[PDB]
Amino acid sequence: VDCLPGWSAYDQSCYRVFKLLKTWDDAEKFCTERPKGGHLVSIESAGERDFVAQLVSENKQTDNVWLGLKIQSKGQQCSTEWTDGSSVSYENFSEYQSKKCFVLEKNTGFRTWLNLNCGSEYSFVCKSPP
């Protein structure tokens, strides 16, 4: 309930939208370095979704913003079979083409999650304990 100046309280956690363009790894790293620690925001309830969407809109973000969701895979991508039944034994996506890191979509008022290149530069939301 008692957050640092600039941060907003929801359900016992503190939240803040940072208007600095970072890649997903740099934003996550930034969030871990806040005084009470923390991470890029996670969204675990309809309540949190709505709170974070309003927070981001209140801050007049005009592009997508990172959240803390990421694809974890063995290879470059997730499909294991081509249409002809054969195995995926070779992959050739560039890093620009890989889409493993999720944003809140500006086009939905920051309510829905889209996977995009991790090296994209976007503002982001951090979540910390008070």
Partner: protein
């Protein structure tokens, strides 16, 4: 069969056909199944197959994009929160992802909306 049919090229026991008609990924795939029994969108299993495909497609299409037989490249993996909490709640954007290959260099892979219309290559096993 024993030989690749007249208009098709051979590489390691498979036959390949570059199609200079622009179709969605679905329609392109279905067209491939109608050319020959066991025909599909091209699949690529090595850098050497990619090289073959490029070598074959580049003089026909020049610098261009071809549908290839993968889809939903970002669907089947685990998605994890950085704060180490369990993914209990989902709020996905609507996506449509199908594999496009470039016809130059080494057949670079691109994500593409599956309803976009492109050139494509068919393949079947002898």
């Amino acid at each position: 069969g024993f030989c690749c049919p007249l208009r098709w090229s051979a590489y390691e026991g498979h036959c390949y056909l570059v199609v200079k008609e622009k179709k969605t990924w679905d329609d392109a795939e279905k067209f491939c199944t109608e050319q020959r029994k066991g025909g599909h969108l091209v699949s690529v299993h090595s850098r050497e197959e990619a090289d073959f495909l490029v070598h074959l497609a580049y003089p026909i299409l020049d610098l261009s994009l071809i549908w290839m037989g993968l889809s939903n490249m970002w669907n089947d993996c685990k998605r994890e929160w950085s704060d180490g909490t369990k993914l209990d709640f989902k709020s996905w954007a609507k996506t449509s992802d199908c594999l496009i290959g470039k016809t130059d260099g080494d057949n670079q892979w691109l994500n593409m909306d599956c309803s976009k219309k492109h050139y494509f290559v068919c393949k079947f096993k002898l």
